[PDB]
Amino acid sequence: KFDIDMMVSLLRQENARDICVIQVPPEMRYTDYFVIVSGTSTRHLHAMAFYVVKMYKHLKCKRDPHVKIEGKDTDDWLCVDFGSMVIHLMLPETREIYELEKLWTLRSYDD
Amino acid sequence: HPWEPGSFRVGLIALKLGMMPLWTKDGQKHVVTLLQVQDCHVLKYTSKENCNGKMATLSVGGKTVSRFRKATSILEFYRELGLPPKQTVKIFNITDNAAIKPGTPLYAAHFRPGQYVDVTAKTIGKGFQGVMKRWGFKGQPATHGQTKTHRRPGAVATGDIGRVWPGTKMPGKMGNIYRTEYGLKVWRINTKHNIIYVNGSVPGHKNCLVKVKDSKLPAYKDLGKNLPFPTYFPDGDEEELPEDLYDENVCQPGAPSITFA
Amino acid sequence: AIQKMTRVRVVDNSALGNSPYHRAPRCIHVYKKNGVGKVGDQILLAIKGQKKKALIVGHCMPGPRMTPRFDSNNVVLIEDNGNPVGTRIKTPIPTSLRKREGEYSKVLAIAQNFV
Amino acid sequence: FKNKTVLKKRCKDCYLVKRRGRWYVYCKTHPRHKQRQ
Amino acid sequence: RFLSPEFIPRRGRTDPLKFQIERKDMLERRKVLHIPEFYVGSILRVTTADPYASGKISQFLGICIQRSGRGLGATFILRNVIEGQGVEICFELYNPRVQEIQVVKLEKRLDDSLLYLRDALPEYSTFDVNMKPVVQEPNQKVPVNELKVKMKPKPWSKRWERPNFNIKGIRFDLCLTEQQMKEAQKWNQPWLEFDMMREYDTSKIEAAIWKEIEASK
Amino acid sequence: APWSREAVLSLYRALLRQGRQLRYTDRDFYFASIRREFRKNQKLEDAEARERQLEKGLVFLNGKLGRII
RNA sequence: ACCUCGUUGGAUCAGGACAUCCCGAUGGUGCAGCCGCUAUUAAAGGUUCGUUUGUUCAACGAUUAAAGUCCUACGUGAU
Numbered sequence: 107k108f109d110i111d112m113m114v115s116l117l118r119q120e121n122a123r124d125i126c127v128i129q130v131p132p133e134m135r136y137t138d139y140f141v142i143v144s145g146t147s148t149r150h151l152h153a154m155a156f157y158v159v160k161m162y163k164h165l166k167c168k169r170d171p172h173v174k175i176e177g178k179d180t181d182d183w184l185c186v187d188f189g190s191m192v193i194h195l196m197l198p199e200t201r202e203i204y205e206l207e208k209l210w211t212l213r214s215y216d217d
Numbered sequence: 218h219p220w221e222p223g224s225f226r227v228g229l230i231a232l233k234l235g236m237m238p239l240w241t242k243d244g245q246k247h248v249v250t251l252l253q254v255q256d257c258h259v260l261k262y263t264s265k266e267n268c269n270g271k272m273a274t275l276s277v278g279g280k281t282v283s284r285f286r287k288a289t290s291i292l293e294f295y296r297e298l299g300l301p302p303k304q305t306v307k308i309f310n311i312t313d314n315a316a317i318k319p320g321t322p323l324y325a326a327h328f329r330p331g332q333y334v335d336v337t338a339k340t341i342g343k344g345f346q347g348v349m350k351r352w353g354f355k356g357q358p359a360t361h362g363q364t365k366t367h368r369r370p371g372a373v374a375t376g377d378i379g380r381v382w383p384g385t386k387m388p389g390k391m392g393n394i395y396r397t398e399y400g401l402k403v404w405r406i407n408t409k410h411n412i413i414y415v416n417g418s419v420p421g422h423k424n425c426l427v428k429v430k431d432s433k434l435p436a437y438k439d440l441g442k443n444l445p446f447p448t449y450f451p452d453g454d455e456e457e458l459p460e461d462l463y464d465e466n467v468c469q470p471g472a473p474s475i476t477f478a
Numbered sequence: 479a480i481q482k483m484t485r486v487r488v489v490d491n492s493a494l495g496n497s498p499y500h501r502a503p504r505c506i507h508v509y510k511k512n513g514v515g516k517v518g519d520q521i522l523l524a525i526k527g528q529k530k531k532a533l534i535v536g537h538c539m540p541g542p543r544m545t546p547r548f549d550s551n552n553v554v555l556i557e558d559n560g561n562p563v564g565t566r567i568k569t570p571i572p573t574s575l576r577k578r579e580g581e582y583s584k585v586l587a588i589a590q591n592f593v
Numbered sequence: 594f595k596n597k598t599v600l601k602k603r604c605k606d607c608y609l610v611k612r613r614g615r616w617y618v619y620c621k622t623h624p625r626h627k628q629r630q
Numbered sequence: 631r632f633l634s635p636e637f638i639p640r641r642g643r644t645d646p647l648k649f650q651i652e653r654k655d656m657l658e659r660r661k662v663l664h665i666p667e668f669y670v671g672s673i674l675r676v677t678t679a680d681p682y683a684s685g686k687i688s689q690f691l692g693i694c695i696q697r698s699g700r701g702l703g704a705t706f707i708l709r710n711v712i713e714g715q716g717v718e719i720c721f722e723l724y725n726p727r728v729q730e731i732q733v734v735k736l737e738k739r740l741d742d743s744l745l746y747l748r749d750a751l752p753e754y755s756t757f758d759v760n761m762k763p764v765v766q767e768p769n770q771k772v773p774v775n776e777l778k779v780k781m782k783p784k785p786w787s788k789r790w791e792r793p794n795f796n797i798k799g800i801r802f803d804l805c806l807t808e809q810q811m812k813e814a815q816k817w818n819q820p821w822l823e824f825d826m827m828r829e830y831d832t833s834k835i836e837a838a839i840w841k842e843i844e845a846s847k
Numbered sequence: 848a849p850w851s852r853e854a855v856l857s858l859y860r861a862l863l864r865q866g867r868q869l870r871y872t873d874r875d876f877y878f879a880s881i882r883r884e885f886r887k888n889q890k891l892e893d894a895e896a897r898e899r900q901l902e903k904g905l906v907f908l909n910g911k912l913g914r915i916i
Numbered sequence: 917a918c919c920u921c922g923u924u925g926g927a928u929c930a931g932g933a934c935a936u937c938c939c940g941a942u943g944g945u946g947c948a949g950c951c952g953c954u955a956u957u958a959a960a961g962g963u964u965c966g967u968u969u970g971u972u973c974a975a976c977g978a979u980u981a982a983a984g985u986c987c988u989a990c991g992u993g994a995u
């Protein structure tokens with residue numbers, strides 16, 4: 107199966123410079139897992155996103171529809187939306203300027 | 218005879234009941250049109266030589282009508298056939314494998330869900346229509362000096378030819394002509410009332426007779442393997458069909474509410 | 479449906495959106511073959527005498543059933559690459575944005591509420 | 594092919610052939626030499 | 631006895647068999663999803679499964695501002711404001727992906743259509759998302775909320791003051807001058823309530839539909 | 848200034864306690880983020896923002912609006 | 917052999933040519949793939965919306981797969 111365990115294992119194997127996971131409650135109608143990972147550069151981001159997408163494609167769930175890779179043209183932020191989990195690859199400056207952590211943990215308690 | 222590749226079977230003549238929504242398991246809504254098979258019978262059979270072509274033909278009728286309102290020759294034809302007269306008679310091109318004896322009834326279960334079908338009928342007659350409604354011409358602006366020309370055709374030709382080309386789009390009678398909708402999916406079949414639920418729209422008005430036949434599109438060339446080849450015979454009684462035959466993707470009413478888990 | 483010349487409401491945390499100006503933001507181009515923008519379509523905006531891309535996240539025109547109809551034509555500023563200009567979206571964002579073809583995960587991540 | 598009013602062989606392997614009604618210069622070694630009347 | 635609006639057909643030349651088939655499907659779906667009695671003006675919470683997510687439900691609470699459509703495609707559009715943003719959703723009653731319909735507050739309004747709440751003040755469309763369901767006595771006529779809303783300045787979605795709309799739930803005296811009301815009266819059409827051939831008598835049709843429903847039970 | 852002097856400290860302790868069993872994310876990054884959140888702001892606020900800050904910290908601790916796993 | 921100066925668009929609907937702007941098929945390339953450039957063939961189909969200007973045009977803005985060159989008595993004003 108392709109799950110969050112496989113996701114974190116693959117990300118650690120490709121050595122993401124920073125990994126975080128958010129457990130999205132079911133009452134929020136988006137997803138189950140919100141993964142946010144930082145990287146060294148746009149090349150590293152592209153490589154790791156491509157690698158995880160290839161692993162998803164090859165692993166299992168033939169009935170599960172294929173998955174886009176968003177943010178290819180931009181360099182500082184890519185994102186991939188799976189059936190039950192969404193990964194946001196970015197650079198440290200992008201992460202600190204968008205503060206997705208505070209957004210997705212404190213829904214209405216930030217600025 | 219059993220079904221062979223390249224065999225074309227007869228179709229039906231149904232009555233357009235109306236439209237209703239339908240939902241597929243993916244969560245999408247499809248509008249569907251109900252076609253009721255009302256007293257549809259095979260009336261006539263002709264061979265390839267006299268079919269005005271090179272394929273056997275079955276004349277099929279439906280929607281029994283009053284004998285008091287028909288011409289004497291038609292009444293004689295139906296008397297020899299042993300049936301009450303039908304409102305419309307349509308000719309279906311078939312191979313000799315699919316020949317059916319005249320007088321045999323035809324039922325909605327002649328089709329099956331998941332099959333693709335072609336429906337031909339006279340479109341709604343809109344009478345003499347102007348060119349804006351008939352051909353979607355732009356017309357002229359409403360103001361800025363425009364006088365007495367808002368919905369008129371502009372130039373109808375060039376000055377050189379000194380004439381108007383045949384087939385030029387002009388005001389005239391719109392609708393009330395035969396049109397065919399191709400490749401419509403049969404979503405469901407109510408065998409009790411002989412209803413076919415056909416995907417999308419069908420030409421013509423409600424309570425109008427439409428001719429329904431297996432789709433001629435290349436993608437659906439050889440999908441007749443599992444269909445009742447000559448036709449469906451309820452008298453065969455091999456397996457009494459359920460009241461409703463559904464396509465696999467159809468969200469049947471009475472099923473537990475679909476959850477995209 | 480958002481066309482050219484439609485005035486639009488920038489629902490975004492961005493300085494361009496939240497900065498007062500004499501002219502309200504006005505759609506300059508709809509990045510669609512028919513010049514009609516629905517939810518998920520990109521448009522080009524004239525904000526503060528500046529041309530900025532933006533994404534439609536709501537409009538008054540009715541859509542398909544089960545989808546929300548908003549009282550205003552809500553738009554989110556995005557860069558040419560695709561990164562949202564702002565960092566927070568306050569008003570609810572339709573969930574139908576997820577499965578539409580096109581990159582919307584960034585906007586969904588930025589969004590606070592969904593309808 | 595290059596369309597030429599007059600066909601000229603360029604190297605040794607350039608050969609004139611009348612095909613499909615018109616003259617051509619073909620060449621195995623130098624396809625750059627391909628000419629059509 | 632409350633017959634849900636979608637069951638009564640709009641008049642036409644359509645065959646009654648089509649309505650019988652459609653009602654069979656509607657009742658057979660109602661056996662699975664309980665469609666409660668509600669009216670335009672009652673507050674509803676609708677829970678529906680999202681195909682965009684994976685087996686996750688979405689809840690929307692709002693005032694039913696319109697009931698429309700007949701048969702299996704019947705819809706009700708209900709309205710709310712979320713963080714100051716007015717939103718309306720048109721829910722299909724017999725869509726298989728509506729998990730639940732809850733009548734948080736069963737009430738009737740002075741009008742059979744509250745589309746003018748778009749032009750009313752936002753307070754008249756604001757409703758708490760987590761408001762608790764009120765309770766009505768089992769044997770009790772449905773309450774009629776005679777609230778007359780206050781309107782925002784005159785540019786409106788529709789000319790609500792025109793008599794063809796027949797709006798009773800708006801305080802026209804507050805927002806419109808007597809001259810404006812008199813001008814609106816030019817569209818009165820007083821004969822239209824008296825032309826007897828325009829009225830649609832659905833007594834027999836409702837009786838037959840009730841027999842069908844009782845047989846389905 | 849805050850709701851109580853010890854409330855912030857107890858909340859920080861509980862944050863570290865629930866980070867003790869952190870499984871999927873980066874523990875070092877989690878601790879660094881908590882340190883940032885509680886050091887770049889909680890030095891010289893006004894008496895009014897303290898209540899909001901501690902309320903948001905308590906909500907994050909509860910994790911009913913999304914928890915770090 | 918000094919100077920000067922001697923019906924037109926638009927809208928509407930378009931018919932046609934190919935000397936092709938895009939879509940199709942090929943040859944070569946001072947193109948490794950991506951591409952560009954060039955040539956042959958291809959007219960079934962398509963060929964945007966705006967600001968200033970009356971503009972015939974032109975420039976500019978934003979797009980587009982492309983925003984082709986023409987003939988048709990401005991093609992067409994008893995529309």
Ligand SMILES: [Mg+2]
Nearest residue numbers: 356357358359
């Ligand atoms: Mg017009």
Ligand SMILES: [Mg+2]
Nearest residue numbers: 363364365366
């Ligand atoms: Mg006029």
Ligand SMILES: [Mg+2]
Nearest residue numbers: 538786787788
């Ligand atoms: Mg309006």
Ligand SMILES: [Mg+2]
Nearest residue numbers: 934936957958
């Ligand atoms: Mg040529």
Ligand SMILES: [Zn+2]
Nearest residue numbers: 604620623626
């Ligand atoms: Zn040579």
